[model samples]
Target: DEFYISIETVGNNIVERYIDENGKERTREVEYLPTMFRHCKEESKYKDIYGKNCAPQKFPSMKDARDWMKRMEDIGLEALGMNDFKLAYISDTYGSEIVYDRKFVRVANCDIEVTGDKFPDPMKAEYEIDAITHYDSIDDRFYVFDLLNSMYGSVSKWDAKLAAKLDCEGGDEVPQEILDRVIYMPFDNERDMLMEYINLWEQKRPAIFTGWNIEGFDVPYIMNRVKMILGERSMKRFSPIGRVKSKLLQNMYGSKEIYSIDGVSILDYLDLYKKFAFTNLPSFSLESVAQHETKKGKLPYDGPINKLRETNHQRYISYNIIDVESVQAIDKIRGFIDLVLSMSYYAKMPFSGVMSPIKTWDAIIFNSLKGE
Candidate 1:
């Protein structure tokens, strides 16, 4: 049976820190809101959702939605036996930071202290490395600072560490092309992570779980990231690249061999109790749906939180935890799992098949045997 793994992501906090800009190497607080907001816009475009409320609405209420998600999670657990899937969750430290030095190219900041004699000037004393790709590293250092700087804010840095285990790396001297692909083009980190996950799945063939859009968001994003990576370096082992002939097929449908399921599709079958179409509802978001559909529904804050980096660090983590809870709730329900299982069986694919609830890590091995 394929292992059922759960996946999620969290971004680094919004607080800023002083980069050693010059010779003085002064450690002053820098705000992260500007760059963070820009990054948020990129994410919104990739998801094809925009504006402030976009994230809040993309998925149905986690509360009303829990039955389906829980059911989905259970299918893997029961079918694959115990703990077959790796609960693969990913969060990023703001890996990229655009500094205002000559109009903000992606730059990396290093945490080095300089002697007063070496360089008195702050900007001149420091080295401006590539920052765009390693925002997560910056996030890590900033998190430590957050604990020390009680006046600034609080963040569960330890928790961030757990989730950021899978964070991707950005490079220095980012080719203009890579920057354009990542920043301007609708980039897909979700696809990159999923592809890595699927490659492992092909290797170990473990069961997998994700909150929603493993098909829509996760798979596609993984494909895009593979494309980007391949663009940079020659194709390596187990890349999902070049499997699909057409770019359109590769993007929309995924390379035909890999199977991923969307939670929304499963929820449609299980949502017999509700009168409204989850997607049809204005802002059919996970948070909104959770609140409207479940008694336990509540957003992290009373009002919408800006995607800016300036928000409190702890608050950012809290919001992510809430999302996990919401997803967990969905994973625990039974009715939803029944539908996913039935769908898998009808397809004549293994329960360890990519899309099925009975999915296992061994699917990859089986497919490899078949020359897929």
Candidate 2:
């Protein structure tokens, strides 16, 4: 007897409906079936389905089905028909399953935390490398780390005085493991801090910088902060392309400036989320995206920013590290980096240009007509 496997999207979860030859139906969350099938195939000791030994022989409860779906989704199972959904058969032993189309590429994940009264404006901002997490695709390793800025509260002379007066202690709350790797900096020196940050980048020399809202915020913010603090000559170090030159251009978003860096690409996961149709999320904030994709997200904090900065510095670091890890998690779950690299390769354009489908199409046409 043969069983038929059918899948459909119920709201946000993918429901896998399995119908046996006897006209009997067994339903399970599509997300859970992948690991279930893998375990049964491998004959692992935990080869039980639905909390019972052997494969599931009956339908799961409506509540159980929904709960399992949500659980799997929260753990980074966003890609459809990849590892999340597959075809399997139950006999004396499990059979082979079909895999979905998947493309892989190497990229690095980057994030920054800044100290500013307002956002997107570098004029009165004092930025620091709160955390930087690099996920290397080649070896499948995550280099998760952060820097300690002694001058975090010193945005201005008044703020510097306040920082000096305030009790900034509480480094003990930070995990000893993370503290061991923390990069410490001198007080009131943004130039040296940024230089050390950039020097670390130079040492790693990743070809791509992947993050959430990096282009619109992180990339431009870093460029402007470096330029303002270190001067134009110092901006060259941040660029992967060549010496840095700033240009302001008007686009649909607003009047924004473009900064080009040599030898590396900036691929923002938030931009990719907007461009792709993977999840039906209400908002694109990092927290929302992570919650929608992986069911896990940043540590909750309702206190004022300054309060968190001053009284709960350890919690603040934890929050920053979670953001970096969330980006890495979402990328792996949704294949965001792979899809962007695929689009860039197919279009023969820079990763930044591929964010806009229309612009990418136009570039392809223009280049074809002017073929070398």
Candidate 3:
């Protein structure tokens, strides 16, 4: 007799049915399995699964089945004899069911910003983070902070002349309120600045570090600069900030290496947009993507890097702030974070590999075949 598996939830029982072609059925009540999986310590409490201590609901909904599927996939449950079962059906209620096969989680988002020595060699560029504006997902607001470094130039053209008039002594031409939030780095205090940034991450506990082209440029550039300027000792101290973890076996877009902190994930809007094909912009630059997504663009700046560093320092800060803001805006407009979580959950892949849909599909296919 050919057999197939069927799953359904009664009043308080999640029943699994093994049925033969002749219509004979052997059923087992597994009401406690979902609860056990929900409370599994290895799963992320912030994502699809809630906290371990939460009360277990009586009846398992379609969402519960999907969540259970993810939990099983997460732990190689197929190898444990839970095999030959696909998401065959789902319905609004117990009696009304239609066959299907699809599944999908949540993570808090953070925004980042960096400024660097322009025109330096790509791999060995010297750079510094001038500002970072983290939009805490929990708080629903932006907190702008600065790294310790002298102003590269005046806030405005007129302010440059004013600062010169004041002999560059009394106070920064930038407004006091603006300066108050920034953490200034003393000269040659790069190590301290890096540590402070790490401290900020620990305080905020952001799950995802997001920005335009962060994977392609910002993260790698920042890490490179950190190692070069901070040296081996400082690098070791800062390694825990965003430690490089397992390499992505199938990274199609960019770096094969994946980096992580204990509870942090890094997402790049550029790669995400391309992965989702969210827009048909001529270019995926932050300004273009921002304009396409949110009808907002970067602050206009036109001058040599050196000139801006010398005369338009205030504008530079404003520019940096807006860049971070634009990244956040684009993410909000696209719902990219939610999409990433869903895709990762459904495909049974890590968040870092979600951008590569092909690789994710391969993983899903392999898992299915292995189960078969």
Report the number of the highest-lDDT candidate.
2
Instruction: Please provide, for model 1 over 24-54, each residue's C-alpha lDDT reduced to its tens digit, 9 standing for 90 to 100.
Output: 1121222211110111322232332222311
Candidate 2: clashing pairs of residues: 74-294, 74-295, 239-262, 240-261, 240-262, 240-263, 241-261, 241-262, 241-263, 242-262
330 in model 2: Cα distance from truth in Å?
A: 0.9
Each candidate structure's TM-score, on Cα atoms with residue i matched to residue i, is: 0.32, 0.56, 0.54
lDDT of 2 at 10: 37
Tens digits of per-residue lDDT for model 2 on 1-372? 323233333335344433344544455543333222222322323432333322322224656545544554554433322222222112111232322122222356656666544453633336454444445544344453434444554221111122222134422233334334333333345556677667766655554677887776677777887777777777777643335655577768657665556445666777777767466777888888888887864444557875555555555545565576677677777776666655644444445566765446544543343221
- lDDT string for model 3 (36-102, tens) is 2213223433442332222122224767655655555566632221221222121111112222221
Name the lDDT value of residue 355 in candidate 1.
41
Q: Which one wins by TM-score: 2 or 3?
A: 2
Ranking of models by lDDT:
2, 3, 1
Report the C-alpha displacement of residue 185, candidate 2, in angstroms: 8.2
Model 3 residue 335 lDDT score: 75
Prediction 1 global C-alpha lDDT: 0.27
Better TM-score candidate (1, 2): 2
Q: Against the true structure, candidate 3 has what lDDT?
A: 0.46
Model 1 has how many clashing residue pairs? Answer: 71
